[PDB]
Amino acid sequence: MDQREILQKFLDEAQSKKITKEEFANEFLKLKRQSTKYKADKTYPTTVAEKPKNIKKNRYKDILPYDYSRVELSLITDEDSSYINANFIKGVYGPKAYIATQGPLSTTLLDFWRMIWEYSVLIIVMACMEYEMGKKKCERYWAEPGEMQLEFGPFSVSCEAEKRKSDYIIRTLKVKFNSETRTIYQFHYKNWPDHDVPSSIDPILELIWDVRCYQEDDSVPICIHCSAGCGRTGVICAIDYTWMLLKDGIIPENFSVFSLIREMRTQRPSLVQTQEQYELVYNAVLELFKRQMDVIRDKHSG
Ligand SMILES: O=C(COc1ccc(-c2oc3cc(O)c(C(=O)O)cc3c2C#Cc2cccc(Cl)c2)cc1)NC1CC1
């Protein structure tokens, strides 16, 4: 089939059969079930993350990176100085399109910039606040205007500009290391779409759009984090992936939101952690298909 046909089918299929909360529940339960079998089978060890030297570098003891996809550090390499709670996530064309990680600890702030630097990351997407439900969900790794430089080891970070949008902030950062200066764009998403508001998914689509404005390709990975580096981090990731497919006309005929999330959850534990976040992905994806079908229609009008 061709893109228009595959998109029309997904569109029609959804219309002719709305999914229900219970079906969503049933779907998501299967995903969690697969994780169980994978555990029992020892398919994705987390040996490195469980090492004593690394325990204190994990924000959530239950959330550890699979050995096979964990991001390795080699910049200014102590013997366990190579570990960070982060996993490479594959893009549509190849691997290492994204790096899903945790909101850094005061103890791993130096590790965070090492990684961002060792992989020439240009974009960081933060999907949480510093404080949530009265708890500290992320240490300050960025810099704000008027603050000058902040120091994390040999790293000097400062903020040149800040673009304030409705639900997020875009901080233009200047990172210096060894007489070299790079520009990093931090996207701080200080809100989240609401389950009871179909339109509330619009802000997240605008976020990813802007991001993609700053990097359309997959030359370097895009770093995405929340607090655990799973949940919201997975949603943004799943949508970007699905959108990249739509934009480049390569939506496999056998495409399902279900398979997508399944693929992701085998690259990072609980990348999309809840049924609510699963539904948001389904809803957001659907909207993307409609917008893409429109593009197909206006190009068919030549
Ligand atoms: O490490 C711990 C403490 O337990 C935990 C407490 C909270 C979380 C947790 O952090 C998050 C951070 C996020 O940033 C998002 C997020 O993306 O929103 C979601 C969660 C989330 C979550 C969740 C969640 C809540 C209810 C139901 C389900 Cl299925 C998941 C994870 C683990 N215990 C170890 C002894 C074993």
- The structural domains of the chain, with segments of one domain joined by +, span 1-302
Task: Tell me how far the alpha carbon of residue 196 is from its chain's centroid.
Answer: 23
| Ligand 1 proximity of 242 Cβ (cutoff 6 Å) | no
| Ligand 1 proximity of 128 Cβ (cutoff 6 Å) | yes
Pairwise CA distance, residues 52 & 57, whole Å: 10
Q: Which of 128, 159, 223, 226 is catalytic?
A: 226
Give buried/exposed letters for 28-51 (b at 16+ CB in 10 A, else e).
Answer: beebeeebeeeeeeeebebebbee
DSSP symbol at 200: G
Pairwise CA distance, residues 100 & 3, whole Å: 29
For residue 287, how many other CB atoms are within 10 A of its CB?
16
**Could you give the count of Cα atoms lying within 13 Å of 188 in the half-sphere of its Cβ?**
18
Residues 160 and 177 sit within 8 Å (Cβ to Cβ): no
User: Phi/psi zone of residue 164: left (φ > 0), alpha (ψ -120 to 50 degrees), beta?
Assistant: beta
Angle at 110 between CA 233 and CA 119, to 5 degrees: 60
| Ligand 1, atom 29, residue with closest C-alpha | 274
Q: Which atom of ligand 1 is nearest to the CA of 59?
A: 1
| Ligand 1 proximity of 196 Cβ (cutoff 6 Å) | no
| Ligand 1 proximity of 35 Cβ (cutoff 6 Å) | no
- SS3 for 129? coil
Query: What's the gap in Å between 127 CA and the centre of ligand 1?
Result: 15
Estimate the crossing angle of helix 232-247 against helix 275-300, to 10 degrees. Answer: 20
224 is written with which tokens? 């995405």
DSSP symbol at 102: P
| Ligand 1, atom 20, residue with closest C-alpha | 228
* Token pair 């939506």: residue: 251
| Ligand 1 proximity of 236 Cβ (cutoff 6 Å) | no
Containing H/E element for 181?
strand 180-189
| Ligand 1, atom 16, residue with closest C-alpha | 231
Task: Note if 138 is an active site residue.
Answer: no
Gaps in the chain after residue (C–N beyond 2.5 Å): 77
Binding residue numbers for substrate: 226-232, 273
Pairwise CA distance, residues 155 & 171, whole Å: 17
The dihedral of CA 293, 294, 298, 299: what is its sign? negative
Query: What's the gap in Å between 233 CA and the centre of ligand 1?
Result: 13
| Ligand 1 proximity of 164 Cβ (cutoff 6 Å) | no
Look up residue 244 and give its amino acid: M
Resolution (A): 2.3
Pocket test for ligand 1, best of 60, 190, 195, 226 (most atoms within 8 A of CB): 60
Pairwise CA distance, residues 84 & 226, whole Å: 15
Pairwise CA distance, residues 228 & 87, whole Å: 12
| Span 1-302 CATH architecture | Alpha-Beta Complex (3.90)
